[PDB]
Amino acid sequence: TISCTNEKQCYPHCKKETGYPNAKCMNRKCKCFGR
């Protein structure tokens, strides 16, 4: 998926995607816990 390192990297990723700021960054990939 995207390319990040720290979990704070997917903060704006999931926030603007689903609307939840809770996101994680593992293996350069971002996940949204606010599905």
Technique employed here was: NMR
Report how far residue 27's alpha carbon sits from residue 16's, in angstroms, rounded to the nearest whole number.
Answer: 21
For residue 26 the two structure tokens come to 């593992």
For residue 16 the two structure tokens come to 């603007």
Q: Which amino acid is at 25?
A: C
Burial class of residue 15, CB neighbours in 10 A (0-12, 13-18, 19+):
middle
Look up residue 28 and give its DSSP letter: T
Closest CA to 1 of 35, 21, 23, 27: 27
Pick the CATH number of 1-35 from 3.30.70, 3.30.30, 2.60.40, 1.20.1070: 3.30.30
